[PDB]
Structure formats: structure tokens, C-alpha cells
């Protein structure tokens, strides 16, 4: 019933190898360094706090706030997230290749690293759509989901299966609710997985 | 006496989960991206080496040296540290929230990654104080400690316990000695842990 030292070493080494491969071992076709980009935020309003002041020699220069581009960058230390006003938001992403989308990942910080002890700014209900071109107003539904505030930091979601599989190079993420924060919603990272067209 | 494969997998997965949470699984109220900031270095002198020259088309542009802000940023590759002249230094940090401080973390690179084989620039004796406002000259002692050059890279230190627990949003780190480097002392990362006031 019990394992040997050699077998324990193999299990440890295999787990660290997967960890080192962006945690998942799967291509992220939204990743900015790999060819993904942010096209649009529609009518979303980036939350303007006016608290992060950059200065030199005592001279005020600029107020700093995070860009929507941080959602397709891998750092997820607290605060490395895009914040929009209210709890409804929109993000249009161009993928690095034309693919058949099969799954999506959403990450948020865990409660143990949040200074208040809660993650009420995290997204709750959301959906993903496939678009044929940047200017399409309503795309094809790829799935509707809920990010669970009592789950793990990284959560994965499976796309709907249809008898005809259409390929897309643009997707739209829509956030419909958050976990109760009354001023804003924060998005740390969104990933898109699937199979490239041959 | 022996463990099963299922039990070994659970131990491995739990260790990687803690590792991914900033190694410790505890909020760092000094972290810059999360709301902390560097207010002052008092009379400390940043070490001026004049060796890192930035150029374009062969035209010299700027000499590069690290900012005190790197002490509240998480990268700790060799050289990603703040260096001050001599072995006495001062750093005044504003926390992201008002808290009851309970513990502090100090990190330095390990000897195996230092090109000389020693870490003589690391801090040795130090203390932490709580301040009521930025312009206070002498704060309340929260503890005095020694970073052990023969210990682990990341070391944690417990604050003094008093019958009345006062809350602070500003702390001061004072370094009194180093591990023998004759020109400078290098600080890689300093963290502050505790419980936020309700």
C-alpha cells in the first residue's frame, strides 16, 4: 500500500514541472506577450481613484491607475488588476491565432492575501462570446459561468458543445455581477484555451 | 507507518498552494502594488557606483541605480535590492491599512546564488518602530532582531507583546550593522504582517 522514496520524488518533480508551465500546461491564446491584445472596453469606465500620485523633487507629475491590458499579463500580486466602476463590465480580446475555443480560465487573489479578509470585488456571474469582427455588437454565446468566491484562486470553465464547431479569433468577456463591493469590480487575469485551425 | 500515493499527492499539492501565495500565505501590508509606499530614507545615502551606463547609438544617457522602492517589490533576483553607504540605514514605510502589527519578514539572496560565495552585504542587527505621523523623530519600539547569514533566505520575526496594543499605519526600519561588507549594505525585501483595525 505504501510508496517508495523513488516514487515520491517522481510525484514531486512532476507537480513542479506542471507548475512551471503557467500552472496549467495549456496554451493561453489571449496572453499579450504571445500575440493577444485588448481591442475595446465598450462603455466600461475605469475606476478613477486619484490616490496614486507620482512625483519628482516634490513636483506632482501623474496619477497612476492600471490599464485593461493587465488582464492578459501573468503577474497577480494584489493590485495588479483592472478595476471598473460598478458591477457590469466588457472586455474585447483578439486571440493570437484563429482557434476552436474549448475552455476559459479566470484568476483572482485568494482571501488570505487580501488585506480586508474578503474578496468582494471579485467577479461573480459572467459569460463569453465569439465575434466574427471587431465591430460586431452581439456575438455567439460560448458559455455562462460563476466565479466561486469560496473556491481556489485559479478556476477553469468548459465551453458549450454544439454540433457545428465555429472558429473565432475575437472573444468578448461580459461581467454581470460581483461579490458585493459597492464601488468597483477587479479583474486579475483571463485566459482562453483551445485548438488552432489547421 | 508508511504513506499512500493519494496522501503523498495531497502533501505536494498543499505545499505548492502555499508557495504560490507569496510563499507565506499572509497579507503583506507594506507591498507597493497593494497600497504601501516609501515615505523617507532620513539621512541614508544611496550607494553611488557610476558603473551601470545606459546609452543609445553610442551616446551616454544615464547612470542606473536601484530605488528604495525596490524593497517593497517582490522580485529578488541578485541585484534587485536597495544599497546604501556604510552599515547604518533608515527606511520609513506607510502601510496600506491601519493595523496591529504582529510580525515582520526580511529576505536576502542565498549564498549559492551570490557570485562571491558570501552575503557579507546582508543586514545583521536591526529594529522596527511604530510612528504616529510621518514627521515623528522617535517611534515606539516593536522589536529588535538579527538576520542570520547561516539561515534560510526568508526569515520571520515576532513583534513584542504589550498589555495595550496600539495600532499604526507608519513603521520605520533601522539597520544597525551588516555581515561585514566594507562599502555598503543591500536590502532585498521587507514585509509587515498583522490584523487590520475594525
Amino acid at each position: 500500500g505504501g510508496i517508495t522514496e523513488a516514487q515520491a520524488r517522481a510525484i514531486v518533480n512532476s507537480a513542479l514541472k506542471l507548475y512551471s508551465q503557467d500552472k496549467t500546461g495549456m496554451v493561453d491564446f489571449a496572453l499579450e506577450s504571445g500575440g493577444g491584445s485588448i481591442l475595446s472596453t465598450r462603455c466600461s469606465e475605469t475606476y478613477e481613484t486619484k490616490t496614486a500620485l507620482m512625483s519628482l523633487f516634490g513636483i506632482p507629475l501623474w496619477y497612476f491607475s492600471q490599464s485593461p491590458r493587465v488582464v492578459i499579463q501573468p503577474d497577480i500580486y494584489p493590485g495588479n488588476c483592472w478595476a471598473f466602476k460598478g458591477s457590469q463590465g466588457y472586455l474585447v480580446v483578439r486571440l493570437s491565432m484563429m482557434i476552436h475555443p474549448a475552455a476559459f480560465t479566470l484568476e483572482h487573489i485568494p482571501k488570505t492575501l487580501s488585506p480586508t479578509g474578503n474578496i468582494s470585488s471579485a467577479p461573480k456571474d459572467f459569460a463569453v462570446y465569439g465575434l466574427e469582427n471587431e465591430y460586431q455588437e452581439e456575438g455567439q454565446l460560448l458559455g455562462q459561468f460563476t466565479y466561486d468566491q469560496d473556491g481556489e484562486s485559479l478556476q477553469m470553465f468548459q465551453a458549450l458543445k454544439r454540433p457545428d464547431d465555429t472558429a473565432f479569433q475575437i472573444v468578448e468577456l461580459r461581467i454581470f455581477s460581483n461579490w458585493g463591493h459597492p464601488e468597483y469590480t477587479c479583474l486579475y487575469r483571463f485566459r482562453v484555451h483551445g485548438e488552432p485551425v489547421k | 507507518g508508511g504513506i499512500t500515493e493519494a496522501q503523498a499527492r495531497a502533501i505536494v499539492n498543499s505545499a505548492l498552494k502555499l508557495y504560490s501565495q507569496d510563499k507565506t500565505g499572509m497579507v503583506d501590508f507594506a507591498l507597493e502594488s497593494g497600497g504601501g509606499s516609501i515615505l523617507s530614507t532620513r539621512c541614508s545615502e544611496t550607494y553611488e557606483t557610476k558603473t551601470a551606463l545606459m546609452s543609445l547609438f553610442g551616446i551616454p544617457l544615464w547612470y542606473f541605480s536601484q530605488s528604495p522602492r525596490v524593497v517593497i517589490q517582490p522580485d529578488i533576483y541578485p541585484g534587485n535590492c536597495w544599497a546604501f553607504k556604510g552599515s547604518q540605514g533608515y527606511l520609513v514605510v506607510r502601510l496600506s491599512m491601519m493595523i496591529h502589527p504582529a510580525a515582520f519578514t526580511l529576505e536576502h539572496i542565498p549564498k549559492t546564488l551570490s557570485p562571491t560565495g558570501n552575503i557579507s552585504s546582508a543586514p545583521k542587527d536591526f529594529a522596527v518602530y511604530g510612528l504616529e505621523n510621518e514627521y515623528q523623530e522617535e517611534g515606539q519600539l516593536l522589536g529588535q532582531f538579527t538576520y542570520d547569514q547561516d539561515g534560510e533566505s526568508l526569515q520571520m520575526f515576532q513583534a513584542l507583546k504589550r498589555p495595550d496594543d496600539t495600532a499604526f499605519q507608519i513603521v520605520e526600519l533601522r539597520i544597525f550593522s551588516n555581515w561585514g561588507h566594507p562599502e555598503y549594505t543591500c536590502l532585498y525585501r521587507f514585509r509587515v504582517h498583522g490584523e487590520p483595525v475594525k
Binding site: 496614486a52 516634490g58 507629475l61 | 532620513r42
Partner: peptide
């Protein structure tokens, strides 16, 4: 005295390293 002058000083504020100060509110997170 030297001990009294050090408290007065803030060499980081008169350097070429830009400062980032949170004016009384944590950023979104």
C-alpha cells in the same frame, strides 16, 4: 548634533528616483 540632523533629512525626496505616494486611500484590489 548629528542625531538631530538625520531626523530632519529625507535624501530620497531630493534624488532622481521618482516617488509614489498613496494619498490616504488603498488602490483597487
Amino acid at each position: 548634533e548629528e542625531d538631530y540632523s538625520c531626523a530632519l533629512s529625507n535624501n530620497f525626496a531630493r534624488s532622481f528616483h521618482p516617488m509614489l505616494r498613496y494619498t490616504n486611500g488603498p488602490p483597487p484590489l
